Amino acid sequence: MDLAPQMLRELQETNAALQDVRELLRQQVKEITFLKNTVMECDACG
Amino acid sequence: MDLAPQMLRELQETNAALQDVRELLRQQVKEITFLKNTVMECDACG
Amino acid sequence: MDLAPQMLRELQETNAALQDVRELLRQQVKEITFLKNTVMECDACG
Amino acid sequence: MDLAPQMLRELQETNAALQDVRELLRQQVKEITFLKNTVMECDACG
Amino acid sequence: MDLAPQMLRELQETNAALQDVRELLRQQVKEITFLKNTVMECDACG
Ligand SMILES: [Cl-]
């Protein structure tokens, strides 16, 4: 009653924030996999 | 009257995102664990 | 249909998902700390 | 019902926390990228 | 009369959980940054 539109707005914000977190992690996972491969192929390692 | 339908939609969307986040983190820890093991076996380190 | 109960269900699913996220992060921190300590003892390093 | 005010307060805290998380992840992606770029120009690797 | 008390409970638990995740992420950034420098001063890199 009356603040319901306020609650919905906060829900949309959380949703947007999660979208970001998600693109951030997909970017992170790709960099981490890059690191992995590279150390995996490091001469000095044997 | 109420915005239940809209709030539920946002909620469903949040959950879908979270499910992808949990899957991304699961994969990330795996890669990190693979990286860890590699380094431990890295000849130049000891 | 009255949507209250469905909303409550999504929230509980959010919580479950977040409890998984916390445990993943928790394990993740432990692996990266281990990796760090490992690199600190990498003889080819400094 | 009479719990709405407090529900909004919890929803707002969630968003504030989420923004912190987003901010920390963005910096994080930055540090991992620097790490990556360092492995690349690391004479003893590839 | 409603499901609010139960809804409030879930919301409160989401927040408690996010608190841990941001705390965990804060600790992780710190480890990573340290790893970053350590690698930055690794003799074997050139
Ligand atoms: Cl992370």
D13 CB neighbours in chain A (<8 A) are none
Contact C6 B7 (CB under 8 A): no
Contact A21 D25 (CB under 8 A): yes
**Residues in C lying within 8 Å of B, measured between beta carbons:** 2-4, 6-7, 10-11, 13-14, 17-18, 20-21, 24-25, 27-28, 31-32, 34-35, 38-39, 41-45
> CA separation (Å) from C35 to D13, E31, E46?
34, 9, 21
| Alpha-carbon distance C10 to nearest alpha carbon in chain E (angstroms) | 10
- Total count of domains within chain B: 1
| Contact (Cβ atoms closer than 8 angstroms) between residue E34 and residue C32 | no
A23 by Cβ neighbours in 10 Å (0-12 / 13-18 / 19+) ranks as exposed
3-state secondary structure of E40: helix
Q: Which of A38, A46, D33 is nearest to B31 (CA)?
A: A38
| Contact (Cβ atoms closer than 8 angstroms) between residue B30 and residue C28 | no
Give the separation between CA A7 and CA A12, rounded to whole angstroms. Answer: 9
Sequence-distant (6+) residues with CB within 8 A of C36 are E31, E34, E35, E38
Give the separation between CA E21 and CA D17, rounded to whole angstroms. Answer: 9
Cα E25 to ligand 1 centre (Å): 7
E10 CB neighbours in chain D (<8 A) are none
**Residues in D lying within 8 Å of E, measured between beta carbons:** 1-4, 6-7, 10-11, 13-14, 17-18, 20-21, 24-25, 27-28, 31-32, 34-35, 38-39, 41-45
Most A CBs within 10 Å, among B2, B6, B23, to test the A interface:
B6
Packing angle of the helix pair A4-40, B4-40 (nearest 10 deg): 20
> CA separation (Å) from E43 to A41, A43, B6, B45, D33?
19, 15, 58, 12, 20
Residue with token string 């620097």 = D34
Q: Which domain holds residue E1?
A: 1-46
| Tokens coding C4 | 């209250």
3-state per-residue secondary structure call for B7-21: HHHHHHHHHHHHHHH
Give the separation between CA C41 and CA A34, rounded to whole angstroms. Answer: 23
> CA separation (Å) from A23 to A5, A18, B20, C18, D21?
28, 9, 10, 18, 13
> E40: domain CATH number?
1.20.5.10
Give the separation between CA B24 and CA A26, rounded to whole angstroms. Answer: 7
**Residue D23 exposure: Cα atoms within 13 Å on the Cβ side:** 9
CA–CA–CA angle B46, E40, E33 (5° rounding): 100
| DSSP string for A1-46 | --SHHHHHHHHHHHHHHHHHHHHHHHHHHHHHHHHHHHHHT-GGG-
Torsion angle (degrees, nearest 10) of CA B31, B36, B38, B39: 140
Give the separation between CA B21 and CA B24, rounded to whole angstroms. Answer: 5
Contact A44 D40 (CB under 8 A): no
| Tokens coding D29 | 């992606």
Residue with token string 């490091």 = A42
A42 CB neighbours in chain B (<8 A) are 42
Cα B1 to ligand 1 centre (Å): 41
- Alpha helices by DSSP H, listed for chain E, are 4-40
Residue with token string 């959010």 = C14
Q: What is the resolution of this structure in A?
A: 2.0
C44 by Cβ neighbours in 10 Å (0-12 / 13-18 / 19+) ranks as middle
Separation of CA A21 from chain center? 4
If you count them, how many residues does chain A have? 46
| Tokens coding A9 | 């707005």
CA–CA–CA angle B10, A23, B37 (5° rounding): 125
| DSSP string for C7-18 | HHHHHHHHHHHH
Q: Which of D21, D28, B13, D26 is nearest to E28 (CA)?
A: D28
Give the separation between CA D44 and CA A43, rounded to whole angstroms. Answer: 7
Task: Specify the amino acid at residue E7.
Answer: M
Give the separation between CA C21 and CA D17, rounded to whole angstroms. Answer: 15
